[PDB]
Amino acid sequence: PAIQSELDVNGEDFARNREAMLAAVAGFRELEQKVLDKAAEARPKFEKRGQLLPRERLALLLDPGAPFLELSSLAGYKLHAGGGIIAGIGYIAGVRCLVSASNSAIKGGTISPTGLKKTLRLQQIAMENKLPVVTLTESGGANLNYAAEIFVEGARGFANQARISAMGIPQVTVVHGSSTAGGAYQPGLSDYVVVVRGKAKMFLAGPPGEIASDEELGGAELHAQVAGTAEYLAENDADGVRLAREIVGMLPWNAQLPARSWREPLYPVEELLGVVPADPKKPYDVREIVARIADGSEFLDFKNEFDGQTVCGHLRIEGHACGLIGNNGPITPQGAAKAAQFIQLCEQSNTPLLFLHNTTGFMVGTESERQGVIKHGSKMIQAVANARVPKLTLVVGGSYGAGNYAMCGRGLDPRFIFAWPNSRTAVMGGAQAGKVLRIVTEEKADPKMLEMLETVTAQKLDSQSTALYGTASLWDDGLVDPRDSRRLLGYLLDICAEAEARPLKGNSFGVARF
Amino acid sequence: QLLPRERLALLLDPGAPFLELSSLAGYKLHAGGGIIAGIGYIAGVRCLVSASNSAIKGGTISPTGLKKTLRLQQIAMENKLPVVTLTESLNYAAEIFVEGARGFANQARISAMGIPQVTVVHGSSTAGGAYQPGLSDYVVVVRGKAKMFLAGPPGEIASDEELGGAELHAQVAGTAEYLAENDADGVRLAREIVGMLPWNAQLPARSWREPLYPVEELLGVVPADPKKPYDVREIVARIADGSEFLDFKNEFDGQTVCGHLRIEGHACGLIGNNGPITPQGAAKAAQFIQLCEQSNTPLLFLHNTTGFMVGTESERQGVIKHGSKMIQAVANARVPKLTLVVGGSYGAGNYAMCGRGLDPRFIFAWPNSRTAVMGGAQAGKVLRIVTEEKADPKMLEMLETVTAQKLDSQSTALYGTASLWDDGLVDPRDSRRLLGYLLDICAEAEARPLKGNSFGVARF
Amino acid sequence: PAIQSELDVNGEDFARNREAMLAAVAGFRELEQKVLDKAAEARPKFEKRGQLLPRERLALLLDPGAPFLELSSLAGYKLHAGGGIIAGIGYIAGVRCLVSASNSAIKGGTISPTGLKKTLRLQQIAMENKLPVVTLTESGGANLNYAAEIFVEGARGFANQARISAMGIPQVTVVHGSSTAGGAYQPGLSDYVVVVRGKAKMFLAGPPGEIASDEELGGAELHAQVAGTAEYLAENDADGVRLAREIVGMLPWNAQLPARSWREPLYPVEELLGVVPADPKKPYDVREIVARIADGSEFLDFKNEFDGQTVCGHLRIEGHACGLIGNNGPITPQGAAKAAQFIQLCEQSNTPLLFLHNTTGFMVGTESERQGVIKHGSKMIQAVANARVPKLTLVVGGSYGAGNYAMCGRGLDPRFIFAWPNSRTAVMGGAQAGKVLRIVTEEKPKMLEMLETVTAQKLDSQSTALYGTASLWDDGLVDPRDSRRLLGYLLDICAEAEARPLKGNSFGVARF
Amino acid sequence: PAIQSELDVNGEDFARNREAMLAAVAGFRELEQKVLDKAAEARPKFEKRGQLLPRERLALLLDPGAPFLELSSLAGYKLHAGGGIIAGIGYIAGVRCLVSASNSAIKGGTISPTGLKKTLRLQQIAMENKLPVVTLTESGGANLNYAAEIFVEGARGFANQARISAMGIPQVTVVHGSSTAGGAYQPGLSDYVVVVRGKAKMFLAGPPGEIASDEELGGAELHAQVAGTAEYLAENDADGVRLAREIVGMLPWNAQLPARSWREPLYPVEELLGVVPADPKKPYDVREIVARIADGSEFLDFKNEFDGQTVCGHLRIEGHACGLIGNNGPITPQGAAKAAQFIQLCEQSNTPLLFLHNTTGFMVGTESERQGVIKHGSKMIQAVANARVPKLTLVVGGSYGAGNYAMCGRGLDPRFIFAWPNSRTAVMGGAQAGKVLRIVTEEKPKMLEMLETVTAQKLDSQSTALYGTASLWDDGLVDPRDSRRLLGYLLDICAEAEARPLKGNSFGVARF
């Protein structure tokens, strides 16, 4: 049952693949460092104020040496980076939570339209995986430039917070700072609010016809003792973070769970750096990736005889059974039928699905259409849409057009989706897009215009298809290093298994702050 | 052959009501989003009906095309309406495509929920557009017009009829269940599919006054713009059966109005603004919604507000916490929630009065209304102050004497309904018969049992 | 919308078909009467005892001119007929019940394998359709020929009675005669027992070291006054039936339902006698049957262009929306696929399914196999087996081999299955069977040209409707002209069951 | 607390009993082997083809030295043995499955009435006990002797497969040989099909106007590559079984369960050979059986003073708390009443029930009848039929007539029923039966003193354990000394089913 790798670790293919992937990883880890440097500018200006930086607060919030998975760290990159939020999934007092912090250190917070989207998305992760939501809030509010592309749709964040509370998923918010206008409802719709003495203020309209101090209009002490909008008053930031840990640590949260050994892979995950060809067009076997993420490198291959371009099978990752769907060519009618069936089978055995995209879309042509490519692809999509088992997507290569849909891309609601930095997501390949514009224009003509239309269109598309663009549009939950792929999937499966097992005390209207 | 609206005239029941939705979607954002859509009747069955508008530059689907399809799907799901679509159909597509998958995911789920989809293909449905019939339950194909393929002929050379014609799909592939001879025969066949379902037989079995004043002179009730604290009760009087209305907790707060009325036999509870929402109006409102959940009474939100009250008093008297409670009820209440934007809808006042992002079941706007993040009033103050103190009336009060009247002027209904901030604009004089129809839709859905299945109906 | 028939109304082949069909009806109808006749040749013994005959019992129990659907009247025709039971769905005091009387005018009641089988099936019908079970009992014991062979499996009937009580479906039993040995438990596991004085005895062992009058042992008065195994003491058969109506009449059974308009067909239902070729080998279009059962003769044909040999489509029957599946040729991969889709659609709309069987089975050959005939036939079976909507089968013709399965024959638990008299059910055609039996054994002199088409002639024994109804492969034969009103009645029953709430309990009602 | 046995351990009657019992075990065990023997007389034909024999297939599929409970090994012993099936509950990769292999070393697999029956019963066992169904298939078709008699009811097996898939109980099928005609649907309605290359064929009709290689028609490669009716292509029998383990091994099946310590009996279980009088007519105390199966030999006797002829009480078996009901005499009104109460109590505490049958049935006579024997027997049956807790039956002795019913014999759906070899199941004792048949006919010369006790001798044919196990009246015969570990294993299975959640779906998994 173990996969035989055909991979040459002291060879010219490998080393150049390692080279091109390390280039990509460094490439995105550089962009990350850049945001970090930009938030050391504010350090002294924070330290003047006796305030910890956002990531200093998280460092004190989180249990030391505990796994932390950060999400959408580059969301919104150059669209007006991280969306104004630092969020992730980690531990707070042995309780796995969705942890958030206004990135105050850059643009005093400020929340971009991709900030709306990221918040919506983190809320969906909190809901689906039943994670308590801990927020260290200190924000400027949304960019004034983007009222319209935000305002009405930004009510959904509040709607969600009201629903999370009724679902029985506790919200704890430390207000380190400003929480003004519309965004004062973010602590207002949390269950447990901590307010920092002197360095904190919530109100709908600030001072700038009545004349008032900010502390007297909506400062900490005002809330903790007059209006009752908070439950705890904290001295400073460290003490605020202490209290967030106290709260969390006083819930009997892990006690609600019921009470409930594996072989490592044959090949080391290090090797994943050289598995994808540097030559993007060059085919390879998704099983080479599988062999380095699966326990014992063991993969039970499903229906490979019927079709080899859509690869299905079973494996374990750190003990957890899953079903895998990956791509070694276009999705043919047979491939979609196989996949649909495989997904219903995993539904039947309560097996989580893992989708590794390297998809170029569906096979096309008269044979394909006459053999049911539409009807079979529809059934695959139906199966992905309707399966209730957890779906985990890893974009390892292509994610093109309807292949993206069929392999459980963002719009199909995977539990989690992460992308390799070599990956590409796009409505189609550049070459196909440009070719087609040539052809419809070749009739609706100067030969050079055609050539230029085709090729420019192509480079334009292929340029946009970069992982960076995908992740920046929240087409994924984040970029990961290929070598993290196994331990990431381990963590994510743990997350989904506990969610399945956890009972919640729901209520009609959400907890009422009387 | 027939045109978009000609198909619809023929699809729908002669003289049955028909409520059209987001007519002006995407107006000047480049209108109606590629789609003529609404709620009407086919063989006695109330459906969500939608037809490609190929006239207006071939239709197209685009940022508002996607929003409008997503929104219509939500309306079909929450109100349990069979979806009957007459389709025909790259500018925006690199950008929209990932999120565009939600339309397909929804189709798969709607099929699993037990709400059938009937699609007539009158023209080309290609690449991604091929999956909307794909993911329909009943598919009618028009002989020699319809074409379905993941890739049209634009390195094989095939004719488009050889590759995805009506006859290929009806006869060989099995992609469709019916072959129609022309536009009108497709439409007929769709009516017959609808008329052949036991849909209304799934429901259980089941008199009023009319208001005192005519409901046909109401183009004069609201002044031009809407910010004015003018009287929502005036409107209530014109919508409410026998103009009878029972003020609720009026004496506790005068500005946030609340009470019961009966529209066309249907009880409901109204939440209105004649002013800002103070911390008492909000408590009052949260309480009332909660009472309405208790008695299973539907909610009407008349938007005519500028936001919550502000000042040290409001903040001391718990405006955040009572506003929060009002949002909690708006969000978690299960009774249907109907919204009419009659005037101002600003800031967190739009949210708390159940504006779009609080998912009213249905939300409609008066042409005179204005939805927006804040007022020109507070705009020039922010722009000023965010450059001021981040020394003159040259670049202090010049910014407000301009920025006020940029937004306090532009802030059009039209932008809201184009951004899909509402489900359309309606003549204010239509408001009673409108709400009457929406309540009836909401009630039919409350009573309708569906037959769900695990994976959607498979077209094997 | 409507179907346009092309079968010549004043035709010749019509009149031919019409004559042949009428001959088959007359045949089985004749045979029904001869079981009535044999029962009537005990009017003296009954009249002497002062008893009503089973069918007089039933005519008094049933409502005046209400529909009454008799079930499995020829069951067990020759396997030693009707099982020793007369049963059906009719009306007692406005309530629709599963009604049953021991046929004690024939061999004195008495139960065999076929009687066990008919009883389990009746019990399934009541369970699935939520029908109060009214039983006019008078047997004694089972055929001693088979008792030892059968007594273990016979316990399932008692198991079912206990479970029916726990489901909240009342059982009313009038004991008109003897019910002794293990059959004492049939009244024993009923909820309401009426016991007729002087004529009625229940005990686990009759007189055959103690000596006793069978009345001292277990007569009506003993069970009503001393032991308390009965609830009502009736004076005579008529008084017993009377008490059974009054029990049904005092239930708020119809009050449990919620509260709740059609065109007739354009072509008279009488025409259904002359629709099926007199020559069964001739092929006909099933839509010609459809056009006489469907309101307005309207029929929406589904996916006909993908495969016209498995016909599907929608219709209304007395306003009831249904989906129909028929055969105009063998079942192809495409037809199976299509039918499986169609059943899923009907489930999705909560639309009942009608199966008109005229199959010879599935298409064969490398192409069929290559195109997925097994996988697709499999999906059609999955859909048939798992669909929640009511499934009604009318065997109108062929029902052979795997096509029998795929079209919701017995083993797939249709809710009801009635066969037309020309129908034929068999593992295959006699021709098909001889040939094969030739060619397999042929290569494992003159014995081919005869052993072949001699087995073919036999196989058309285990193949007439009669052998089918007798084996309980259908719930009865019916005159084709009843087909519309039949399905109407079945649809009503199915719809009422769907809507009806029941008061379950843990152990059944306890006769303390 | 403990029971104190008085059966002489170094006794004579013990040794007598012990010898007689051992003779009956040896008997049936011998007969089990002779079915193994007849299968082994095809090692050449298998070895030539390069096949593993059914039992080699099964030994490779099962986990090393895990328990394996074989079911209905003598089914159909002489009604033309084991059904053409070898089946049981054992372990595949840690998972407990219902495991089945076509017995294609005997008459080439092949299915009859008894094979239909054994299959429906296996399917019930899997459904009720939530066991993945692993099937190593190789048949061809059914006995052509019975195919036409049986093909309609045979569809129920396919119905069950479709429903098992919809329940969320996975079916894994390795096709080692042919599965043609209607039996193509057995792999067709399985969730995972493994098809062995070269040896394996599925088609609806084999070559016998088109001409084709059976491989062009439906061989492994065709179904795996072209049609897609299989999921895995195995090289050989061993490789197929291999793939079947790996499928089971990759399910998170045991991960679905929640997480979860006894005294042995004071008296060795071996002693159970010498507990039952060699002379069955002799009466014994059932507590002597109890004292060897119960932990600590402890037994809490329930309501013994009300009636000591129906014994009830509580015990633990490998820590499992159970309630037990046995027979030390016929069933009185008081004993029925008591047993019915006892079952209700066991339900209330969620305590499983063991039925040890040694009944001759119910008490008779005017007093019995007067004291409510029918009503009370009825309540006992209601309780047996309706109780939700697992019911396990061990036929240790007599199981006659209505006592068979009341003690949860076959027709009351015990979850499992195994019979000891001395056991006897019959509508009554042969003596009882002759006498009666005398006296009824006697008054309706020399023919009494012989027709009487000649029918008595016959009736002890339809009465040995063998005729019972062959008719599927039990799930198998078992060596009395296995009784404790048997019940242990059954209790575990029942407890795991209770606790196990399933992923239902609407139509079963679709092999698109």
Grouping H, G, I as helix, E, B as strand and the rest as coil, residue D481 is helix
Method underlying the structure: X-ray
Q: How far apart are CA D497 and CA D390, in angstroms?
A: 10
Give which of D167, D503, D506 to mutate to test B binding, by max B Cβ within 10 Å. D506
Q: How far apart are CA C198 and CA C190, in angstroms?
A: 21
- Contacts for C500 with CB less than 8 Å, ≥ 6 apart: C130, C256, C257
Amino acid occupying residue D152: V
Tokens, residue C90: 């009719």
A261 touches D at CB < 8 Å: no
A259 touches D at CB < 8 Å: yes
CB–CB contacts below 8 A, A to B: 267
Report how far apart the first and last C-alpha atoms of chain A are (Å, whole number).
Answer: 61
CB A192 within 8 A of CB A173: yes
From residue C457, alpha-carbon distances to A359, C427, C431 in Å are: 60, 14, 8
**Cα angle, residue D397 at apex, residues D394 and D402 outer, rounded to 5°:** 85
| Residue D172 DSSP class | E
C379 touches B at CB < 8 Å: yes
CA C206 to chain centre: 35
Q: How far apart are CA B261 and CA B272, in angstroms?
A: 13
Q: How far apart are CA B263 and CA B272, in angstroms?
A: 16
Domains belonging to chain D, first-starting first, are 1-257 (3.90.226.10), 258-512 (3.90.226.10)
Q: Which of D407, D409, D392 is nearest to D468 (CA)?
A: D409
A494 neighbourhood in chain D, CB within 8 Å: none
Shortest distance between the Cα of A423 and any Cα of chain B, in A, equals 15
A364 touches B at CB < 8 Å: yes
Asked whether the beta carbons of residue B114 and residue C379 sit closer than 8 angstroms, the reply is no
Grouping H, G, I as helix, E, B as strand and the rest as coil, residue B258 is strand
Asked whether the beta carbons of residue B453 and residue D507 sit closer than 8 angstroms, the reply is yes
Q: Which of B192, B187, B200 is nearest to B88 (CA)?
A: B187
CB C202 within 8 A of CB C179: yes
Q: What is the DSSP string of A387-423?
A: --S-EEEEEEEEEEHHHHHHTT-GGG--SEEEE-TT-
Q: How far apart are CA C377 and CA D185, in angstroms?
A: 8
Asked whether the beta carbons of residue A185 and residue B421 sit closer than 8 angstroms, the reply is no
Q: What is the DSSP string of A14-54?
A: HHHHHHHHHHHHHHHHHHHHHHHHHHHSSHHHHHHTT---H
Grouping H, G, I as helix, E, B as strand and the rest as coil, residue A64 is coil
Largest CA distance in chain B: 80
A338 neighbourhood in chain D, CB within 8 Å: 228, 512
Shortest distance between the Cα of D364 and any Cα of chain A, in A, equals 54
- Contacts for A412 with CB less than 8 Å, ≥ 6 apart: A381, A384, A385, A391, A405, B101, B105
CB D486 within 8 A of CB D318: no
Amino acid occupying residue A82: G
Tokens, residue B210: 């009319």
- In a 13 Å sphere around the CA of A492, the CA atoms on its Cβ side amount to 26
Tokens, residue C372: 């997925």
**Cα angle, residue C459 at apex, residues C454 and C461 outer, rounded to 5°:** 115
What sign does the CA torsion over A229, A230, A233, A238 have?
A: negative
Tokens, residue D324: 């037990």
- Calculate the CA dihedral of residues D313, D315, D321, D327 and round it to 10 degrees: -40
Q: For this experimental structure, what is the resolution in angstroms? A: 2.4
- In a 13 Å sphere around the CA of D284, the CA atoms on its Cβ side amount to 26
CB D175 within 8 A of CB D192: no
A474 touches D at CB < 8 Å: no
Q: How far apart are CA A427 and CA D147, in angstroms?
A: 57
Residue whose token pair is 């019915």 = D340
Asked whether the beta carbons of residue D191 and residue A321 sit closer than 8 angstroms, the reply is no
Amino acid occupying residue A111: I
- Calculate the CA dihedral of residues C86, C92, C96, C100 and round it to 10 degrees: -20
Q: How far apart are CA C206 and CA C59, in angstroms?
A: 31
Q: What residues pair up with B138 in beta bridges, in sequence order? A: B118
Grouping H, G, I as helix, E, B as strand and the rest as coil, residue D174 is strand
**Cα angle, residue D64 at apex, residues D62 and D67 outer, rounded to 5°:** 70
Residue whose token pair is 């993941």 = B150
Q: Which of C123, C58, C115, C117 is nearest to C91 (CA)?
A: C58
* Residue-wise burial string across D157-182, b where 16 or more C-beta atoms lie within 10 A, e elsewhere: bbbbbbbbbbbbbbbbbbbbbbbbbb
- Contacts for C498 with CB less than 8 Å, ≥ 6 apart: C390
Chain A's closest residue to D252, CA to CA, is A321
C349 touches B at CB < 8 Å: yes
Asked whether the beta carbons of residue A376 and residue D512 sit closer than 8 angstroms, the reply is yes
Region of C299 please: left (phi>0), alpha (psi -120 to 50) or beta. Answer: beta
Amino acid occupying residue D84: G
Asked whether the beta carbons of residue D440 and residue C208 sit closer than 8 angstroms, the reply is yes
Residue whose token pair is 């296996």 = D122
CB B46 within 8 A of CB B195: no
From residue A289, alpha-carbon distances to A24, A268, A488, D145 in Å are: 18, 11, 14, 56
D191 touches A at CB < 8 Å: yes
Q: How far apart are CA D409 and CA D403, in angstroms?
A: 9
Residue whose token pair is 């006869």 = B171
Q: Which of C296, C355, C397, C271 is nearest to C10 (CA)?
A: C271
For A499, the enclosing helix (H) or strand (E) is helix A485-501
The minimal CB distance from A349 to the residues D170, D228, D258 is found for D170
Q: Which of A335, A357, A268 is nearest to A5 (CA)?
A: A268
B199 touches C at CB < 8 Å: yes
Q: Which of D363, D391, D356 is nearest to D377 (CA)?
A: D363
Shortest distance between the Cα of B113 and any Cα of chain C, in A, equals 9
Grouping H, G, I as helix, E, B as strand and the rest as coil, residue C274 is helix
Tokens, residue D131: 């066991």
Chain A's closest residue to D234, CA to CA, is A305
| Residue D182 DSSP class | G
D503 touches B at CB < 8 Å: no
**Which residues of B, range 139-168, sit inside 8 Å of C by Cβ?**
167
The minimal CB distance from A373 to the residues B150, B316, B332 is found for B150
User: What is the arrangement of strands in the sheet containing D69-71, beginning at the earlier edge strand?
Assistant: D69-71, D85-92, D95-102, D133-137, D171-175, D192-196, D232-234
Asked whether the beta carbons of residue A222 and residue B316 sit closer than 8 angstroms, the reply is yes
| Subunits adjacent to chain D (3 or more Cβ pairs under 8 Å) | A, B, C
Exposed/middle/buried for residue C33 (C-beta within 10 Å: 0-12, 13-18, 19+): exposed
Asked whether the beta carbons of residue B458 and residue A382 sit closer than 8 angstroms, the reply is yes
The minimal CB distance from C305 to the residues B114, B171, B201 is found for B171
B451 touches D at CB < 8 Å: no
Grouping H, G, I as helix, E, B as strand and the rest as coil, residue C146 is coil
- In a 13 Å sphere around the CA of C269, the CA atoms on its Cβ side amount to 16
From residue B187, alpha-carbon distances to B2, B10, B115, C1, C345 in Å are: 10, 7, 19, 13, 20
- Contacts for C499 with CB less than 8 Å, ≥ 6 apart: C257, C258
Q: How far apart are CA A260 and CA A268, in angstroms?
A: 29
The minimal CB distance from D510 to the residues A303, A316, A341 is found for A341
Amino acid occupying residue D14: F
CB D274 within 8 A of CB D17: yes
Q: How far apart are CA C223 and CA A296, in angstroms?
A: 73
Q: What residues pair up with A175 in beta bridges, in sequence order? A: A137, A195
Shortest distance between the Cα of B176 and any Cα of chain C, in A, equals 7
CA C488 to chain centre: 16
Give which of D137, D342, D374, D412 to mutate to test C binding, by max C Cβ within 10 Å. D374
Q: How far apart are CA B352 and CA C259, in angstroms?
A: 41
Q: How far apart are CA C297 and CA C265, in angstroms?
A: 5
Q: What is the DSSP string of D267-310?
A: S-GGGGGGSS-SSTTS---THHHHHHHSGGGB-EEESTTT-SSE
Q: Which of B191, B259, B201, B83 is nearest to B444 (CA)?
A: B201
Asked whether the beta carbons of residue D255 and residue A321 sit closer than 8 angstroms, the reply is yes
Q: Which of A345, C385, A2, A288 is nearest to D231 (CA)?
A: A345
The minimal CB distance from B172 to the residues A370, A401, A510 is found for A370
- Contacts for C246 with CB less than 8 Å, ≥ 6 apart: C93
Tokens, residue D401: 């007539």
Exposed/middle/buried for residue C128 (C-beta within 10 Å: 0-12, 13-18, 19+): middle
CB A14 within 8 A of CB A278: no
Q: How far apart are CA B217 and CA B428, in angstroms?
A: 10
| Residue D75 DSSP class | T
For A149, the enclosing helix (H) or strand (E) is none
From residue D381, alpha-carbon distances to B453, C187, C229, D307, D376 in Å are: 38, 13, 15, 18, 9
Tokens, residue A225: 């003792």
